[PDB]
């Protein structure tokens, strides 16, 4: 199913503290070389809350699974039924989101659906107040199997750039289960990069992303 | 999936009804024993009088409460669905009058099985059988013929329900159903469920209501 370019749908409904936004995104993907690159409008205008700290939460499906690796890829394996992340996300010395998403097939183009909900943020906090830089750095995604729920699990911790030369972690806790019925990996990690930029022709507030994702922790 | 059975289990029951575009809904509480094949219930028709006779709805209102004797074990899908469930829908063709569609869904829930039915109701004469409130409080003894859908990995089932009328006819009322399951986890020779049924009242319940008592047995097999 991912023998080539495939299109991207992704919708995130938000609420943080009591702000509501809806954000929607379009692009592409193509696992084979494990290439992200989407563009975010966020419809209902000034986000609440940095972007960088959407990044995870707007299809790891798309991770590059090198062939010595291909039994391991849990994520493909689910499609085109699809499957569901669920995140809790804790930000160190601020609040918590907990976010729940579905990742189907839709005739041809990979959707993701995304619920997210935010609650005890400090406002003029580094969140609330708008602190971090427009980066995202590069981290290592660990994967263990779950066979009890038939899925996996997945633990990672994201460094936020902070503009006052400091950084803002954010500690994740992820689990993803397959929608229909039909492989559970060994332990390995997906290693990250990621980069932030605008589109000057657009008034709207947004988000450029590309990202490159690549497999790994076995010989 | 038969284990689930071993015994006396709770019974939840909704049904969502429409029939000629009036809307009413009915829950019924009680209790199945598989090991024998029983089903004693009662059903509280909570929107008001019914405007269809309350046999109309026996077939729509659990067949996994079948005994099924020890030599055709092996044919009970209904067991060999739960606790996921399955699905059962059917259009029923009332002869010389209207027409039922039903959809259901029979899952566990914790550890009292549930039965959520939707029911849709068309072409029904008014002052007809059902409409004119013209049958018997009764419901005959039947035999519910089984046959495996390889195809839908699932079971189809047809039978004729007899519906005494109060002027000594008998109004005929064809079943079509299909049951798939929910999960993904038995599928049956050619066999039959032999039913018998009493309609009984609650006195001091004011309500219109219906107590039913149920003996279901599977057999067609040596």
């Given at each position: 199913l991912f023998t080539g370019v495939v299109?991207?749908?992704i919708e995130l409904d938000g609420d943080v503290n009591g702000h509501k936004f809806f954000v929607r995104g379009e692009g592409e993907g193509d696992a084979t070389i494990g290439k992200l690159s989407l563009k975010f409008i966020a419809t209902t205008g000034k986000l609440p809350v940095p972007w960088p700290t959407l990044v995870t939460t707007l299809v790891q499906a798309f991770s590059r699974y090198?062939?010595?690796m291909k039994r391991h890829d849990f994520f493909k394996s689910a499609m085109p039924e699809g499957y569901v992340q669920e995140r809790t996300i804790y930000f160190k010395d601020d609040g918590t989101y907990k976010t729940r998403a579905e990742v189907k097939f839709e005739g041809d183009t990979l959707?993701?659906?995304?619920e997210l909900k935010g609650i005890d943020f400090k406002e003029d906090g580094?969140?609330?107040g708008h602190?971090?830089?427009?980066?995202?750095?590069?981290?290592?995604v660990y994967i263990t199997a779950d066979k009890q729920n038939n899925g996996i699990k997945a633990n990672f911790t994201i460094r936020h750039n902070v503009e006052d030369g400091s950084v803002q972690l954010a500690d994740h806790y992820q689990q993803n289960t397959?929608?229909?019925?039909?492989?559970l990996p060994d332990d390995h990690y997906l290693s990250t990069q990621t980069i932030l930029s605008k589109?000057?022709?657009?008034?709207?507030?947004?988000?450029?992303?590309?990202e490159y994702v690549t497999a790994a922790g076995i010989t």
């Amino acid at each position: 199913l991912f023998t080539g370019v495939v299109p991207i749908l992704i919708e995130l409904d938000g609420d943080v503290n009591g702000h509501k936004f809806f954000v929607r995104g379009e692009g592409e993907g193509d696992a084979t070389i494990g290439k992200l690159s989407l563009k975010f409008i966020a419809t209902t205008g000034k986000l609440p809350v940095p972007w960088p700290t959407l990044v995870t939460t707007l299809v790891q499906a798309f991770s590059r699974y090198p062939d010595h690796m291909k039994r391991h890829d849990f994520f493909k394996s689910a499609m085109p039924e699809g499957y569901v992340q669920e995140r809790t996300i804790y930000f160190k010395d601020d609040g918590t989101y907990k976010t729940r998403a579905e990742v189907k097939f839709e005739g041809d183009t990979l959707v993701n659906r995304i619920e997210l909900k935010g609650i005890d943020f400090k406002e003029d906090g580094n969140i609330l107040g708008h602190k971090l830089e427009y980066n995202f750095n590069s981290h290592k995604v660990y994967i263990t199997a779950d066979k009890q729920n038939n899925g996996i699990k997945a633990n990672f911790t994201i460094r936020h750039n902070v503009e006052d030369g400091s950084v803002q972690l954010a500690d994740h806790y992820q689990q993803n289960t397959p929608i229909g019925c039909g492989d559970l990996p060994d332990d390995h990690y997906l290693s990250t990069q990621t980069i932030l930029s605008k589109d000057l022709n657009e008034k709207r507030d947004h988000m450029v992303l590309l990202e490159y994702v690549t497999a790994a922790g076995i010989t």
